[PDB]
Scaffold this active site. Structure first.
Site, PDB file in Angstrom:
ATOM      1  N   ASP A 524       5.872   7.827  -3.832  1.00 18.36           N
ATOM      2  CA  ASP A 524       4.711   6.973  -3.991  1.00 18.36           C
ATOM      3  C   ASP A 524       4.164   6.562  -2.627  1.00 18.36           C
ATOM      4  O   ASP A 524       4.922   6.189  -1.728  1.00 18.36           O
ATOM      5  CB  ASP A 524       5.173   5.732  -4.749  1.00 18.36           C
ATOM      6  CG  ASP A 524       4.035   4.916  -5.283  1.00 18.36           C
ATOM      7  OD1 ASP A 524       3.402   5.375  -6.258  1.00 18.36           O
ATOM      8  OD2 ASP A 524       3.778   3.825  -4.735  1.00 18.36           O
ATOM      9  N   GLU A 553       2.240  11.263  -2.368  1.00 13.94           N
ATOM     10  CA  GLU A 553       0.851  10.885  -2.130  1.00 13.94           C
ATOM     11  C   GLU A 553       0.663  10.712  -0.635  1.00 13.94           C
ATOM     12  O   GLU A 553       1.055   9.693  -0.067  1.00 13.94           O
ATOM     13  CB  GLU A 553       0.548   9.566  -2.811  1.00 13.94           C
ATOM     14  CG  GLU A 553       0.565   9.611  -4.299  1.00 13.94           C
ATOM     15  CD  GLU A 553       0.364   8.232  -4.840  1.00 13.94           C
ATOM     16  OE1 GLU A 553       1.297   7.409  -4.696  1.00 13.94           O
ATOM     17  OE2 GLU A 553      -0.741   7.938  -5.349  1.00 13.94           O
TER      18      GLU A 553
HETATM   19  O1  LIG Z   1       1.487  -7.393 -10.178  1.00  8.89           O
HETATM   20  C1  LIG Z   1       1.900  -6.322  -9.329  1.00  8.89           C
HETATM   21  C2  LIG Z   1       0.689  -5.472  -9.102  1.00  8.89           C
HETATM   22  O2  LIG Z   1       0.365  -4.934 -10.339  1.00  8.89           O
HETATM   23  C3  LIG Z   1      -0.716  -4.078 -10.198  1.00  8.89           C
HETATM   24  O3  LIG Z   1      -0.474  -2.977  -9.329  1.00  8.89           O
HETATM   25  C4  LIG Z   1      -0.095  -1.800  -9.972  1.00  8.89           C
HETATM   26  C5  LIG Z   1      -1.252  -0.810 -10.035  1.00  8.89           C
HETATM   27  O4  LIG Z   1      -2.316  -1.387 -10.768  1.00  8.89           O
HETATM   28  C6  LIG Z   1      -0.748   0.403 -10.748  1.00  8.89           C
HETATM   29  O5  LIG Z   1      -1.828   1.333 -10.790  1.00  8.89           O
HETATM   30  C7  LIG Z   1       0.442   1.008  -9.997  1.00  8.89           C
HETATM   31  O6  LIG Z   1      -0.033   1.523  -8.783  1.00  8.89           O
HETATM   32  C8  LIG Z   1       0.732   2.581  -8.251  1.00  8.89           C
HETATM   33  C9  LIG Z   1       0.152   3.926  -8.658  1.00  8.89           C
HETATM   34  O7  LIG Z   1       0.273   4.197 -10.014  1.00  8.89           O
HETATM   35  C10 LIG Z   1       0.987   4.993  -7.964  1.00  8.89           C
HETATM   36  O8  LIG Z   1       0.723   6.308  -8.457  1.00  8.89           O
HETATM   37  C11 LIG Z   1       0.732   4.917  -6.472  1.00  8.89           C
HETATM   38  O9  LIG Z   1      -0.615   5.174  -6.101  1.00  8.89           O
HETATM   39  O10 LIG Z   1       1.055   3.630  -6.057  1.00  8.89           O
HETATM   40  C12 LIG Z   1       0.520   2.528  -6.748  1.00  8.89           C
HETATM   41  C13 LIG Z   1       1.259   1.331  -6.184  1.00  8.89           C
HETATM   42  O11 LIG Z   1       2.616   1.553  -6.386  1.00  8.89           O
HETATM   43  O12 LIG Z   1       1.415   0.015  -9.864  1.00  8.89           O
HETATM   44  C14 LIG Z   1       0.998  -1.091  -9.173  1.00  8.89           C
HETATM   45  C15 LIG Z   1       2.205  -2.016  -9.091  1.00  8.89           C
HETATM   46  O13 LIG Z   1       2.791  -2.182 -10.332  1.00  8.89           O
HETATM   47  C16 LIG Z   1      -1.942  -4.786  -9.715  1.00  8.89           C
HETATM   48  O14 LIG Z   1      -3.023  -3.888  -9.533  1.00  8.89           O
HETATM   49  C17 LIG Z   1      -1.663  -5.447  -8.405  1.00  8.89           C
HETATM   50  O15 LIG Z   1      -2.762  -6.226  -8.006  1.00  8.89           O
HETATM   51  C18 LIG Z   1      -0.453  -6.319  -8.637  1.00  8.89           C
HETATM   52  O16 LIG Z   1      -0.123  -7.002  -7.458  1.00  8.89           O
HETATM   53  O1  LIG Z   2      -2.122   0.734  -5.004  1.00  8.89           O
HETATM   54  C1  LIG Z   2      -2.750  -0.005  -6.034  1.00  8.89           C
HETATM   55  C2  LIG Z   2      -3.754   0.885  -6.755  1.00  8.89           C
HETATM   56  O2  LIG Z   2      -3.064   1.926  -7.360  1.00  8.89           O
HETATM   57  C3  LIG Z   2      -3.888   2.883  -7.968  1.00  8.89           C
HETATM   58  O3  LIG Z   2      -4.836   3.416  -7.053  1.00  8.89           O
HETATM   59  C4  LIG Z   2      -4.456   4.687  -6.571  1.00  8.89           C
HETATM   60  C5  LIG Z   2      -5.506   5.666  -7.033  1.00  8.89           C
HETATM   61  O4  LIG Z   2      -5.475   5.646  -8.426  1.00  8.89           O
HETATM   62  C6  LIG Z   2      -5.090   7.018  -6.545  1.00  8.89           C
HETATM   63  O5  LIG Z   2      -6.035   7.963  -6.996  1.00  8.89           O
HETATM   64  C7  LIG Z   2      -5.066   6.982  -5.027  1.00  8.89           C
HETATM   65  O6  LIG Z   2      -6.336   6.832  -4.430  1.00  8.89           O
HETATM   66  C8  LIG Z   2      -6.522   7.726  -3.362  1.00  8.89           C
HETATM   67  C9  LIG Z   2      -7.509   8.809  -3.796  1.00  8.89           C
HETATM   68  O7  LIG Z   2      -6.946   9.548  -4.802  1.00  8.89           O
HETATM   69  C10 LIG Z   2      -7.709   9.735  -2.629  1.00  8.89           C
HETATM   70  O8  LIG Z   2      -8.707  10.715  -2.908  1.00  8.89           O
HETATM   71  C11 LIG Z   2      -8.165   8.994  -1.397  1.00  8.89           C
HETATM   72  O9  LIG Z   2      -9.447   8.464  -1.551  1.00  8.89           O
HETATM   73  O10 LIG Z   2      -7.271   7.928  -1.111  1.00  8.89           O
HETATM   74  C12 LIG Z   2      -7.064   7.020  -2.163  1.00  8.89           C
HETATM   75  C13 LIG Z   2      -6.086   5.972  -1.615  1.00  8.89           C
HETATM   76  O11 LIG Z   2      -6.728   5.340  -0.555  1.00  8.89           O
HETATM   77  O12 LIG Z   2      -4.155   5.993  -4.646  1.00  8.89           O
HETATM   78  C14 LIG Z   2      -4.539   4.717  -5.059  1.00  8.89           C
HETATM   79  C15 LIG Z   2      -3.654   3.658  -4.377  1.00  8.89           C
HETATM   80  O13 LIG Z   2      -2.414   3.684  -4.992  1.00  8.89           O
HETATM   81  C16 LIG Z   2      -4.611   2.139  -9.074  1.00  8.89           C
HETATM   82  O14 LIG Z   2      -5.447   3.092  -9.712  1.00  8.89           O
HETATM   83  C17 LIG Z   2      -5.407   0.974  -8.561  1.00  8.89           C
HETATM   84  O15 LIG Z   2      -5.968   0.250  -9.644  1.00  8.89           O
HETATM   85  C18 LIG Z   2      -4.477   0.056  -7.804  1.00  8.89           C
HETATM   86  O16 LIG Z   2      -5.239  -0.929  -7.170  1.00  8.89           O
END
Ligand SMILES: OC[C@H]1O[C@H](O[C@H]2[C@H](O)[C@@H](O)[C@@H](O[C@H]3[C@H](O)[C@@H](O)[C@@H](O)O[C@@H]3CO)O[C@@H]2CO)[C@H](O)[C@@H](O)[C@@H]1O
Ligand SMILES: OC[C@H]1O[C@H](O[C@H]2[C@H](O)[C@@H](O)[C@@H](O[C@H]3[C@H](O)[C@@H](O)[C@@H](O)O[C@@H]3CO)O[C@@H]2CO)[C@H](O)[C@@H](O)[C@@H]1O
Ligand code: MG
Ligand code: MG
Ligand code: MG
Ligand code: MG
Length: 930
Positions: A524, A553
């Site tokens: 991650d 990622e």
């Molecule tokens: O309350 C904890 C945290 O919850 C929420 O964050 C979560 C994201 O919304 C959720 O998408 C997921 O994000 C992870 C992606 O799925 C993963 O593939 C990769 O990109 O990393 C992301 C971060 O680990 O999980 C996070 C955490 O559970 C909410 O949006 C936050 O504001 C909140 O603080």
């Molecule tokens: O970390 C919290 C965040 O998690 C999830 O966001 C992830 C996006 O869903 C995931 O696609 C990726 O975003 C990247 C784009 O794919 C990539 O093309 C490029 O633009 O960089 C982006 C990251 O900067 O990762 C994010 C971060 O984990 C979730 O969907 C969010 O709601 C949440 O806030």
């Protein structure tokens, strides 16, 4: 020397409080170097310290605590290499006789004063750098956790700033049976305690007495072991375990082999990943025994719809299951009596959830309905003006069993809620029984999603703060000025650039590799890790399993000021894979952050950009053809050096094809690239097609759009990755970020009745801005049923079977791709949306890798017209037997290969054609010179 001097009872006194300690912008980076802006050009710069209280002014504005004198200096090379983001800070030297150990036991404050000894600024000190410089090498040489040996047990915890550490031993019923002061090692700052083998199975915590800079107090608390390998229910206590114990293994575990090879690049390129979640697999499957639904052991229910479906996917060429977080997450309560799930009575929900009991839904408390029954009745009048399904489900989410789990509590213990018994070692054997079933009975390799880039919490008070209670301010990345834990990741950002956290990561991966037989790891937010740390971890794990595969990622993390990041760009040539966003966005259309009308305007190759525009899009032909350039490049492995003809007819290397201002092609080998068009993050492929498809694209066309989109991944040279349920047109009812949207929105129906589309408006907090566009598009066509689901599964298994059938699809090595792979229908006169890739097995390529063919053509006609190709006239090209055997159910239904070699493809079709190999290797399909 001078005395530095400064609701209240005098103005004089409140005036003095304004000149006190503020922020934390001094950095003690090595034994003798301190970096701090507040001390520049100041005649008096000192590091004050107090073992047991705060560095504070005494009664008449005097700083009386013990101090160390600091002299101006210039930063060393070593320091600038370690902390380049601090290299511009004013440097100051400490006397080389300073007892660093003594100062690090309590509060340290950097204080600056004028020549008359008058105070200017005083700030707290970030000490992670000096901790590494003082202790890290000695501490790296030791092993941590509760370690059973032939002599008994040795406990060890790294706590170089703690004043005291005691090992507290608990009975099974959680009564204290012993509290042992631990022995501090002065060289490493580790604390150890050695005892007998009778401590096997004992519960334990470490009682810390430790200064925490966030609270500025010497805290006293009990903390679980960051190296825990077993836990009590809900992670409250650690537990002494020997993972090698045969009692913790399924029968035959020691002989478990990896079903798919991962040794060579060609082996790796066959990787075809099905990204899955423990509840998404079984929570809805009535053919899984009720007591195994949502559990690791559901994978052993061989007669269930879900397991039979996975077995068929495996038989057809899905090779790997990737598991969403199955380490110990924090965001599900593992005490079953504190949880209510939608299959259970609404009365149970009310007894566990006070938000529900105080909500507009409280009237359902003494109904006889289950929560799911209530959600079902709410569907009929749910809409953008009354989003009542999500209104109830948002409350359910607080106390259900559902979370993706990107919320690390303990990195090296299985999650407890996925076990039938979360108390103690039982989950270990159940997890292994699942791993064994996947490899042995389903025939797939296993990848674990790991989340080392953050912790669930930090600070001295949160239940789930582990690392930051034991060594405060070390394991988390902090803002350079305030000392606040950064939250760029989502949560409490970790510091993998610090040596003992890098060690924790590698030691954790070693357990998953050796003790749990995991075949690969998806990191991650890998961009938040130093490239050097990911590579060091890979070197250490390769010594344990030479065929382990790492990917993650590799998005930009904005950490490049601190270290070289483990990004797509920087990992070129290393063999560490990264998800590619290039083909993903070109085929899906748009990007992850699109909202409102952009979700519909931004059509992709898979949804008819250019060729089948919807009523809102303004996409030009040029733009559409640019998306096709990115798609072709991705089908060839997204290589930096691959040479193609672009939309204007120009000769371009992959790095010269633009992706939002970045070089499109970035990899050295296709095994460094993971292609995908659907993932747990963001909208499912089906929901994207539903946002983007023209109103006149009927249901059957949309099913073919789903398959055409997946064909660019499955028939490409990159590693193939997909979301669980893409083969079932999976919907999340438009939910973009479904991590806490429960069983309801994450449902996958292995009874094949529907794809979970149109089950209520998604969560308003994140998708409310999309309600207008959702309402406009949602009802364009019917919701898929059994007929469409079966047809999609057949399309999907046709694609994976084709990929599996020939090594030409999966060349592995970048130079080999460049020698063999080419494209037709390129340039300014191309037929838009027709992707034609050739793969040479003829004499000019080298050896024949496939005895049955001299070459392959992949033709993806992402368009509503039939297209004819003359490029292979005069050749012996034949439609693949796999596709011929599927008849009118094939993605190639209606494809015509004429006598003269001309090929006609119907609308929204995929054809794999081949040159049959005869007595000797033939001419094949040589790459055109450019
Ligand atoms: O309350 C904890 C945290 O919850 C929420 O964050 C979560 C994201 O919304 C959720 O998408 C997921 O994000 C992870 C992606 O799925 C993963 O593939 C990769 O990109 O990393 C992301 C971060 O680990 O999980 C996070 C955490 O559970 C909410 O949006 C936050 O504001 C909140 O603080
Ligand atoms: O970390 C919290 C965040 O998690 C999830 O966001 C992830 C996006 O869903 C995931 O696609 C990726 O975003 C990247 C784009 O794919 C990539 O093309 C490029 O633009 O960089 C982006 C990251 O900067 O990762 C994010 C971060 O984990 C979730 O969907 C969010 O709601 C949440 O806030
Ligand atoms: Mg847990
Ligand atoms: Mg939940
Ligand atoms: Mg920064
Ligand atoms: Mg051949």
């Amino acid at each position: 020397d001078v005395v530095v001097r400064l609701v209240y009872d005098s103005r004089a006194d409140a005036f003095r409080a304004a000149f006190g300690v503020a922020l934390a912008d001094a950095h003690w980076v090595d034994k003798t170097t301190l970096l701090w802006p507040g001390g520049e050009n100041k005649p008096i710069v000192r590091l004050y310290y107090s073992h047991s209280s705060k560095v504070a002014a005494d009664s008449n504005g005097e700083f009386s605590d013990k101090y160390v004198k600091l002299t101006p200096t210039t930063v060393s090379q070593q320091v600038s290499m370690r902390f380049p983001h601090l290299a511009s800070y004013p440097a100051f030297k400490l006397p080389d006789d300073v007892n660093v150990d003594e100062l690090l036991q309590g509060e340290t404050v950097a204080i600056a004063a004028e020549s008359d000894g008058i105070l200017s600024s005083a700030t707290q000190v970030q000490t992670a750098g000096v901790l590494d410089d003082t202790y890290a090498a000695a501490a790296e040489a030791l092993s941590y956790g509760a370690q059973l040996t032939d002599s008994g047990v040795t406990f060890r915890v790294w706590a170089p700033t703690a004043q005291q550490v005691e090992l507290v031993i608990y009975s099974a019923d959680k009564k204290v049976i012993a509290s042992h002061p631990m022995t501090r090692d002065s060289a490493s700052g580790a604390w150890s305690w050695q005892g007998g083998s009778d401590l096997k199975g004992a519960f334990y915590r470490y009682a810390m007495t430790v200064y925490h800079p966030q609270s500025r107090k010497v805290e006293q608390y009990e903390v679980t072991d960051p190296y825990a390998h077993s836990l009590s229910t809900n992670s409250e206590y650690s537990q002494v375990v020997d993972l090698n114990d045969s009692a913790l293994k399924p029968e035959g575990w020691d002989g478990l082999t990896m079903p798919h090879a991962q040794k060579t690049k060609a082996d790796l390129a066959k990787m075809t990943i099905h990204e899955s979640h423990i509840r998404d697999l079984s929570a809805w499957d009535q053919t899984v025994p009720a007591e195994l639904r949502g559990k690791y052991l559901a994978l052993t229910a061989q007669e269930s719809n879900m397991v039979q479906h996975l077995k068929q996917l495996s038989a057809s060429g899905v090779t790997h299951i990737e598991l969403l977080p199955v380490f110990d997450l924090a965001t599900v309560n593992e005490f079953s009596d504190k949880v209510a799930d939608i299959q259970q009575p609404f009365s149970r929900l009310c007894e566990v959830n006070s938000a529900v009991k105080s909500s507009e839904f409280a009237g359902y408390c003494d109904s006889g309905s289950t929560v799911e029954e209530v959600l079902t009745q709410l569907k009929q009048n749910d809409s953008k003006d009354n989003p009542q399904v999500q209104a109830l489900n948002t409350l359910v989410a607080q106390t259900d069993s559902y979370n993706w789990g990107y919320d690390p509590f303990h990195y090296t213990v299985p999650e407890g809620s996925y076990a039938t018994d979360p108390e103690g070692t039982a989950r270990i054997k159940e997890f292994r029984t699942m791993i064994q079933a996947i490899k042995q009975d389903l025939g797939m390799n296993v990848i674990m999603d790991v989340v080392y880039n953050h912790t669930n919490a930090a600070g001295p008070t949160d239940r789930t703060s582990v690392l930051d209670k034991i060594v405060p301010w070390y394991y988390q990345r902090l803002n350079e000025t305030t000392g606040s834990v950064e939250s760029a990741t989502c949560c409490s950002d970790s510091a993998p650039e610090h040596r003992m956290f890098a060690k924790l990561i590698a030691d954790s991966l070693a357990v998953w590799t050796t003790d749990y037989k995991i075949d690969g790891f998806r990191f991650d937010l890998m961009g938040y890790h130093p490239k050097a740390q990911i590579l060091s971890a890979w070197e250490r794990i390769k010594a344990l399993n030479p065929d382990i595969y790492f990917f993650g990622e590799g998005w930009d993390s904005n950490q490049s000021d601190r270290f070289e990041i483990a990004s797509q760009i920087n990992l070129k040539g290393t063999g560490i894979g990264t998800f590619s966003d290039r083909l993903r966005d070109a085929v899906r259309g748009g990007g992850p952050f699109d909202s409102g009308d952009a979700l519909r305007q931004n059509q992709g190759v898979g949804s008819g950009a250019g060729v089948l525009p919807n009523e809102l899009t303004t996409l030009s032909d040029d733009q559409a053809r640019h998306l096709a350039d990115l798609t072709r490049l991705g089908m060839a492995g997204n290589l930096a050096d691959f040479v193609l003809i672009d939309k204007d007819g120009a000769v371009k290397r992959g790095s010269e094809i633009d992706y939002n201002g970045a070089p499109g092609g970035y990899a050295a080998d296709p095994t460094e690239v993971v292609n995908y068009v659907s993932k747990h993050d963001n909208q499912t492929l089906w929901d994207m097609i539903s946002y983007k498809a023209a109103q006149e694209a009927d249901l059957d066309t949309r099913v073919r759009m789903q398959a055409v989109s997946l064909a660019t991944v499955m028939l490409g040279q990159g590693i193939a990755f997909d979301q669980q349920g893409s083969e079932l047109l999976r919907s999340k009812s438009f939910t973009r970020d479904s991590y806490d949207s429960g069983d309801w929105f994450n449902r996958v129906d292995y009874s094949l009745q529907d794809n979970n589309y149109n089950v209520g408006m998604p969560r308003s907090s994140d998708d409310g801005s999309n309600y207008d566009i959702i309402a406009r598009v949602k009802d364009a066509v019917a919701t898929p049923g059994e007929t469409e689901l079966k047809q999609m599964t057949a399309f999907y298994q046709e694609l994976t079977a084709l990929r599996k059938s020939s090594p030409l699809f999966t060349l592995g090595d970048g130079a080999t791709v460049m020698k063999r792979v080419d494209f037709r229908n390129t340039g300014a006169d191309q037929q838009t949306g027709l992707l034609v890739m050739t793969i040479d097995d003829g004499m000019q390529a080298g050896a024949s890798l496939d005895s049955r063919v001299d070459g392959i053509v992949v033709a993806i006609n992402a368009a509503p017209e039939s297209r004819t190709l003359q490029d292979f006239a005069g050749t012996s090209l034949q439609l693949s037997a796999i596709q011929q055997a599927a008849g009118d159910r094939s993605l190639a239904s209606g494809v015509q290969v004429a006598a003269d070699g001309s090929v006609t493809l119907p609308a929204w079709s995929v054809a794999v054609l081949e040159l049959p190999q005869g007595e000797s290797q033939g001419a094949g399909l040589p790459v055109s010179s450019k």
